[PDB]
């Protein structure tokens, strides 16, 4: 403030006038411990000096040396903003780095600068306002801004070296920060890939003993797992299949073994495998991930073959479960139909139905206990798990009502019948039904069901109330008129309101108005639904079917609730020295073979 | 014109003339001169729908000696984030005939829904909506309570007598209140209804409903039974009016609904064609019936009821000339099927050509109109005087407005 307004003389000799004015305030030599730090609410003189950028070479060396030669105890840089307003710990070294001024950061780190202390830019809360997230570290800020020179100076700085494995308040590292800011646009993906590879190579060169890609944040996610969870497909794919030739061979994930022609036999790397590892990449993609791209991530080269092998192994149990459910449904239907030697058969049938209901209820309760969050995230492709549970519950209740000698068991049981048959459709995904993209289109358009339902309910329960109000001088019930109109709408009945009612000229007008309004509403429904199929071709039913199969095999690898399967065997392919559990994949690419020579 | 070359030429000439006028005559401000209609160049550009020049004038910045004649002053930029300080004189408060008022009401170009999404207006309207959503939902709740009272009173009217009399009195009072409010609105906004009836028809319906219910109450005091029909209408219409409030609790409204609501410009032609068909065939049929079916209205109603699936034809019985009645009925049915199919194809042709995925802009325009109307307060007690306060005066002496922008693409392109 005061120093800033006394430093308005840019040209001339501004290095000496401020020194002459300041000294030690000329009257308070020992009172500068706390009376000096009151010029602003956090914006000190050094920040203004490094933020000026008025000339090509700003006068910053000599004032810093002047303050260094007389003051040694009052470190200005270590002080940070304790107020949420005007940043929350934003040191001047961040400004020096991000203004692309190597000289400023160099001079700052000559004396007294502490790198990797704190930034507190934005982690989860508090510091907000559409702020910039860069990992809240000076090295991470330099890396995210594509400044190779600053990073190179920081890593092997003779004065104070910056550790490359440092973690911020959120637990993220520099690689995590690069993953977070990644975007699917080609230029952002190229920039982040280049920075990632450069940082990996530099860390290998300087520190060959530490592995930077095995460090997990507070959530327990490595950069690969974090990229899979956040839906950043480009960087995830690049990390999944990367190969380096030369001295950088060890830090590679794909090792090409031998290529004959257009065929290549590569040896991909694991640690993205379901078995022997909790929170695998596939488990995160199937359940924890919520981005729309999750169906395009299961088609990548190693995951595709891994899931295909697992499905080919477990299709037998899939169809065995199908057969058991079908037999149970036949028994249930026969028992329900033939219940208006035989008494023993009926009692046995009822006992078996109760046992099956209990079994299904316990299985679905276990599934819901294990996968609470998946239902909330992805109810679109997991609603069957609800229906089964519901059906089971219903049938159990029916059996109880049969033992209380009340007739009310008959309705519920009937419901438990019909719903059960619908559940058989769940098994259409095992015997090679793609499912059609259009079916997905309708199943996703039901996000608009609530609005149209509200509009139709308003129409129906306004017109019914008006009609029953005219009827008074039976039709006393709102329910009667509402049901009559609804039955007319779906073609299940006739209106029959035109008879008598005295005021026969107004009842007619109300009925025509209702009919025209509901026709308009249905036409609006149809046009809103159909608009998607003529714009988004999205011929990717194969990917969605693969995702469904992946979810199924992931769920059924655990085994039944009453007897957990044999422990997940890590065995996918024998260890290769390249000491790493690998996986052999064969690719064929005629286009690549023809382009090359 | 909105063509790129015309916009570039006019922008270059505008900036050159502004700089030259500043150099030669630094005391006069050329952008504060209004024509006979009272419109400055910015207001005129907003009214005429010239989006390109309007946007350029709205956000222009000059570095050097031409700094004072600028409207946007960039304060500080960290990374892809920039904190700019836009200029007012396009604000609703403290100024009549503002830019936003002209865009919402006086403008008639199709581009008006794309002008409210510009950088300062977007944030200004968002702040105003966030302030006034509470009153919006309070009005919603009051209307809902009134509708429940009206429905209960109508249903339970075939200690209790006092309750019924009180209910009738409250219904009369509510009808009078709504009638007065809508009359005030129509007095203030005569031209807007004519220009933009497409997005302002609800203001009519409300008024109509109010009028109807008031009349019904009068007919109840004359001891005539004819109050019962009208009142019933005043019931059903009222419920439909609740749909007006679906725009406050975050319903976008869907682009398709706009497609149907705009296709009703073709309603008149199809209605004329169908009326000609119906009243030709009905006259022919009643002419054959003579040797009852004496009424044109009877035959027309019978055919219309058959068309919408509400009844049966039943003309095939007797009539002696039973071979001609059949031919007329088949001809009518085929013609009306062709007409309905033509209607459907004409309606659906738009959704397969014009994707126009801009429902957000239309919803923003609806919210802007709503907040502009409700900032004035109720008719019986005008709100507190429009406070000019949007942000403190900045020397840059100008009422400014602080906006924060984030642009990853611009940050990545530059270095």
Residue numbers in the entry:
A (entry chain A): 76 to 415, 429 to 561, 589 to 693, 701 to 719
B (entry chain D): 258 to 415, 429 to 561, 589 to 693, 701 to 719
Quoted passage from the original study:
TRPV2 is a ligand-operated temperature sensor with poorly defined pharmacology. Here, we combine calcium imaging and patch-clamp electrophysiology with cryo-electron microscopy (cryo-EM) to explore how TRPV2 activity is modulated by the phytocannabinoid Δ9-tetrahydrocannabiorcol (C16) and by probenecid. As expected from the previous studies, the channel architecture displays the classical domain-swapped homotetrameric assembly of TRP channels. Each subunit harbors a transmembrane domain of six transmembrane segments (S1–S6) with S1–S4 forming a separate voltage sensing-like domain, while S5-S6 and the intervening pore helix (PH) form the pore domain that lines the ion-conducting pathway.
Although the binding for probenecid remains elusive, C16 associates within the vanilloid pocket. We tentatively assigned this density to C16 because of the associated structural changes in the channel pore region, and because of the lack of a similar density in other maps of available TRPV2 structures. However, the size and shape of the density does not completely match C16, which may relate to the limited resolution and the C16 occupancy. Consistent with C16 binding, residues H521 and Y525 that line the C16 pocket rotate considerably between TRPV2apo-1 and our two structures to provide space for the compound. Notably, no indication of a ligand at the CBD site is present in our structures obtained from C16-treated sample. The putative C16 binding is at a different position than that proposed for CBD in TRPV2CBD, which however is a closed structure and retains a lipid in the vanilloid pocket. Finally, an important observation from the comparisons of the structures determined is that C16 affects TRPV2 beyond the local binding pocket, and thereby significantly increasing the pore width along the conduction pathway (and see below). Taken together, these data indicate that D536 is a crucial residue involved in the interaction of TRPV2 with C16, and of importance for a proper synergistic interaction between the C16 binding site and a separate binding site for probenecid.
